[PDB]
Design an enzyme around this catalytic site. Structure first.
Site, short mmCIF file in Angstrom:
data_model
loop_
_atom_site.label_atom_id
_atom_site.label_comp_id
_atom_site.label_asym_id
_atom_site.label_seq_id
_atom_site.Cartn_x
_atom_site.Cartn_y
_atom_site.Cartn_z
N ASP A 283 0.87 -1.17 0.00
CA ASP A 283 0.00 0.00 0.00
C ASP A 283 0.90 1.23 0.00
OD1 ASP A 283 -1.68 2.15 0.50
OD2 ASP A 283 -2.91 1.10 1.97
N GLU B 69 0.77 2.14 13.66
CA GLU B 69 -0.31 2.14 12.69
C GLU B 69 -1.48 1.34 13.27
OE1 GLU B 69 -1.55 0.01 8.57
OE2 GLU B 69 0.59 0.40 8.86
N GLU C 294 -10.34 -3.77 15.29
CA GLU C 294 -9.13 -4.37 15.88
C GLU C 294 -8.86 -3.87 17.29
OE1 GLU C 294 -5.63 -4.75 13.33
OE2 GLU C 294 -6.83 -4.07 11.61
N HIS D 134 -5.55 0.21 1.44
CA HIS D 134 -6.00 -1.12 1.81
C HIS D 134 -7.12 -1.07 2.86
CE1 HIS D 134 -3.28 -0.46 5.26
NE2 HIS D 134 -3.96 -1.43 5.87
#
Ligand SMILES: NNNCCN(CC[C@H](N)C(=O)O)C[C@H]1O[C@@H](n2cnc3c(N)ncnc32)[C@H](O)[C@@H]1O
Ligand SMILES: NNNCCN(CC[C@H](N)C(=O)O)C[C@H]1O[C@@H](n2cnc3c(N)ncnc32)[C@H](O)[C@@H]1O
Ligand SMILES: NNNCCN(CC[C@H](N)C(=O)O)C[C@H]1O[C@@H](n2cnc3c(N)ncnc32)[C@H](O)[C@@H]1O
Ligand SMILES: Nc1ncnc2c1ncn2[C@@H]1O[C@H](CSCC[C@H]([NH3+])C(=O)O)[C@@H](O)[C@H]1O
Lengths: 343, 343, 343, 343
Positions: free
Chosen positions: C31, C123, C132, C280
């Site tokens: 990406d 990130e 997440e 992405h």
């Protein structure tokens, strides 16, 4: 009379008012497949009319009687129940055919004729052939037919075949989907979702389509107008066993019809099949509420049951199953209230 | 009853069969202008409903009653004559409002209500406002209204304006000239041309149009539903004297209508004018038999007389003349059978 | 530990197994918008790293630590809980950075760092930013941050806007329609039709789309990573009031996010908006089970509520209402298990 | 339990959460070959079911139990461990079969049945037949089977065959060589190229292929479900001696399987071979690390060893050599994480 006994007044009024309009006669007359085919059937079998007595059942503007006159008929009794009978008489006079065409206002089940006739002509076909129930008037008129007399049309073929059309299905499903809303302007409509689906899917779809949507060769159901009795059309049971040519979703059954004019000189066919030029009858499609999956080689079996109602139409019951899987679908449709989809 | 005495049974059957369809209720409900405006009128005038007794005349699906419920009504009597009444009952139950909304199956002229109400709500407007003659049921319902009660809508305005539409006028003859040929498949049809013309001109035209075809500020005829008696709608005489804004040929009169909900907080207007977003009422145009030339500044005067008939509609008699010229034209139309021209 | 207390072991095993694969690292690294923008943010703010102590939360293959090393960081602690940690070590050695990058295997909530850091890089963004629940680990790591310390990224912006997309809606509904069948191989499935629709519409849709489907200017919800506590992310409430720019059906809400690296030299933005090059993360759309009709000028108001669950994701409840009509829609979505539509 | 002892909790949770989705059941149900062949197998052997007691191991939606009911079964115990059990119960009720189908929520290794059964039905096949290790549950369930009992399916055949596919082979290195660059954003990734290669090769490849890539007649390994014990599936050794029909490079072994329902009336086969219509099992290919050159007529000998693991799958060890040359290759694969290549 036979007509009034099988017909609600409310329906008859509306029905004959409808055909009382010149614009409707115009629309029928401008169907050149219909009009041309009728003229061809009559004229190319001129020997079946020459110096004969003719009965035109529901003559409307009188066009078929004029065709009969062109073919050499000695006398044509033209029966018409709507006010259009007045207009037909005008045309008889303006065409100087008073000696050959005799308009008899009234219902064919009620009027009196001076003599028996050699041949009966008429255009009693409606959507899916049977709509309007005019075939019964046509058959009823045989009381005026000499023993060896003929009928134009002579026979009628109803064709049915399974089709796939996801777009049509979701088009109607979408319309029914309106009643799935939990908060339409704050109102929960969902309780009526089922009633909405039922209603929308009771509507036969009148329009045309590409023949490539058909999943199997059509099944044929034949009515012989020379042999059939009026009562025969009260309850029509059409069994079918399709041999599937393609795999996929069967969204319903497509209907169309042919009629044949079996004359002495030649047989002329009038067809409303999707393989043929379009007529004002188009084709008719009855949707399943839920499509059936079938693979090529499978057999789709069941019955199409048509019950005549007092609104000059039919209650349609379609039951179909994929024999190999037992996947079964049933639907009920109201032929009197179709959905006109064309362009 | 009052209803049956003024209505041919045949018409009533068709009429209430028509509104028995969920698809038709849906058609009306999906008109955002109509539904949104009714909702707005009711809710923004919440003081006219909170803890009040309401009568909903011809509730159909029951949407207006739910709006009245949203506004805080104590008890709502929702009268419906078609079978839709059964579906309204379902929604009442599913929306947990059985304690506040009571569905009454039957005609408002025939059912018995237990008490007087504070306000009557309804959507009785048809084409040209008056078509369907439901306004008389609305006004008839005032026998259940307290002397200090209110009507939603409170008033209705019908607007008339002269228009020019060469193509619309010519269209009639283009269609009628089908009959003007000496050998349609060998038949001379021309003797019926005049009859075809007359038939087309008797049909008011339902569709919309560009406001630029209008040649004068509309003339307004107001019905105050709080003051009016149903008898007042049996014969509606609308005199007009248009002050022409443009020079040209006047081919007929255009019709539209507004209704106003005059509440305690505010007045809300629902308009079907051609200057406003389109509604399912569209607009209506009635042709003169012969066009009338008028100069800008001239006056086009005459009368539009609406005569109620037992087919739940009106016969429209229009007479108009150019005062400066004496050029005069008329027409007589059947509003029950309009031509739906909208593309 | 803080991680184990808020996380089902089953979810954690799966989660860290997923990131143990090199193919997944490759996918993320390829990406270019992501990787290039991260490098740009770090290198163009090199002074924020020069001779500083760095913590890399969830370093994976270690790319961000290498960027920090390029910017002159004195020492970088690279924390990673998956087996990828061993691959990072390989790269640190083969790139001769053993004296500066220290891989510390384990969860940031469970490891022990030798010293406090000047800046934390990571990130932690997932789909819709919050999937997440890695943002909480990011915030948790602030326990190692000096009072004068910084965070890269520094802030995150969630954007949400109403969209129209009949195809997507029909697409999902079609899938659900399978469970409407009354006779699938002779079995009646329809009783589960309701459960099926719920399940399919529970799936947020991950893909991209034309910005022209958006019906109003987006609403923004900002999380400041320098100030927020990880407890702040257990329940995220995002109220919204959209001023509709177009009329039509609102089929749901679209989501994307921006993050900003607020350095000493310049602020660098990483955006996943549909007006920007695709990443992405793509974009995320939450469908309504029933679309809401609204006209331009109307107001669409409501709440998007995110409830953190122990499967490292969120339970999403969206409630939206057209203020002018009271048309209201509610949906629940499972962010952990979206439908990847992109092709 | 036997299940919990051979299965990590984390794997089990994910496994049964997967089958808790209606969409997954749907995917399996819409595999016509699978579902149709099962129905066919059961119904065409109605004597094995009529008035019999049946156990359905892992009934999911309950479809197989309904097939057993269609065949005349007196009682069906349908065992299901995922939440789908709750949906199956709904279907038994809505299909008016509560008197004949008893849904038992739980793992077949843990529930108790009230009586012994005449026949066990199930669909326990995974990729390469053995994936998911559900065959052991199927075999475990034999504790409820009368000594008279039958198993549907009765036997399972795993087929192995050598294939050549240069492009599939090269694809692995094309993907892995992403890591073979000295400055990916300034970082030398090359030290991980070997690890990336190994990772890709450890993944069995799921998709289909042209049968012309096969280089020898398949070797067959049969599991007889009437005879086999659970423990027999913990270590599966499949020796092979392929007689090469074509010359070329062997890049690995292709896998597919058949199951046979050996009833009293007839034997029905369900095949996932590449010569047969595609199923949701596709086929599986395991690459060799180094291809082996073979000439037509040469023999390729070795062993495929499947070792069950607690992630409900197998560690695959393949060793092969060309007998005439001594050229040897091997590979270790993780059947739990296959690569879905199908497009
Ligand atoms: N598309 N079809 N159905 C027939 C259309 N027309 C044919 C028009 C004419 N043959 C032409 O081709 O121009 C039926 C006409 O027959 C009339 N009709 C119907 N049932 C009747 C009855 N029991 N007794 C007398 N007339 C009756 C009806 O009023 C209509 O005008
Ligand atoms: N698209 N994104 N979401 C995040 C992707 N990546 C970051 C990419 C990373 N910077 C790279 O360039 O490879 C998440 C990574 O952070 C790890 N991770 C997640 N939660 C963790 C925890 N509590 N402690 C330690 N490591 C943890 C995880 O194993 C994964 O490797
Ligand atoms: N496509 N493959 N193979 C398996 C699919 N399904 C068949 C679905 C259904 N019978 C159909 O034919 O459509 C397996 C089903 O068996 C269940 N299952 C698996 N191991 C289990 C155990 N030890 N005890 C109880 N249930 C268990 C599992 O939850 C799944 O729902
Ligand atoms: N005399 C009458 N008594 C009762 N209902 C009537 C009468 N005349 C017409 N209706 C009904 O009034 C309705 C007019 S349509 C208005 C429907 C609903 N209030 C809405 O605004 O959506 C139709 O459903 C008719 O069946």
């Amino acid at each position: 009379s036979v007509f009034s006994e099988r017909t609600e007044e409310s329906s008859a009024v509306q029905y004959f008012q409808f055909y009382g309009y010149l614009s409707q006669q115009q629309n029928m007359m401008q169907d050149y497949v219909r009009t041309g085919t009728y003229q061809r059937a009559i004229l190319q079998n001129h020997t079946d009319f020459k110096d004969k007595i003719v009965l035109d059942v529901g003559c409307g503007s009188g066009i078929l009687s004029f065709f009969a006159a062109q073919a050499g008929a000695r006398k044509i009794y033209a029966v018409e129940a709507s006010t259009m009978a007045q207009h037909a008489e005008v045309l008889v006079k303006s065409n100087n055919l008073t000696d050959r065409i005799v308009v008899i206002p009234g219902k064919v089940e009620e009027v009196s004729l001076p003599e028996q006739v050699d041949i009966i002509i008429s255009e009693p076909m409606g959507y899916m052939l049977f709509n309007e129930r005019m075939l019964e008037s046509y058959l009823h008129a045989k009381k005026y037919l000499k023993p060896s007399g003929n009928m134009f049309p002579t026979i009628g073929d109803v064709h049915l075949a399974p089709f796939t059309d996801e777009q049509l299905y979701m088009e109607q499903f979408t319309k029914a989907n309106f009643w799935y809303q939990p908060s339409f302007h704050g109102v929960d409509l969902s309780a009526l979702r089922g009633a909405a689906v039922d209603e929308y899917f009771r509507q036969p779809v009148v329009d045309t389509f590409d023949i490539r949507i058909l999943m199997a060769k059509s099944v044929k159901y034949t009515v012989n107008f020379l042999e059939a009795k009026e009562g025969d059309l009260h309850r029509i049971e059409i069994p079918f066993k399709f041999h599937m040519l393609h795999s996929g979703l069967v969204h319903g059954l497509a209907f169309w019809f042919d009629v044949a004019f079996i004359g002495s000189i030649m047989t002329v066919w009038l067809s409303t099949a999707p393989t043929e030029p379009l007529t004002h009858w188009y084709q008719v499609r009855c949707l399943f509420q839920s499509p059936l999956f079938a693979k090529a080689g499978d057999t789709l079996s069941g019955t199409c049951l048509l019950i005549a109602n007092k609104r000059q139409s039919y209650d349609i019951s379609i039951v179909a199953q994929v024999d190999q899987t037992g996947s079964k679908s049933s639907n009920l449709l109201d032929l009197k209230n179709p959905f006109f989809r064309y362009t």
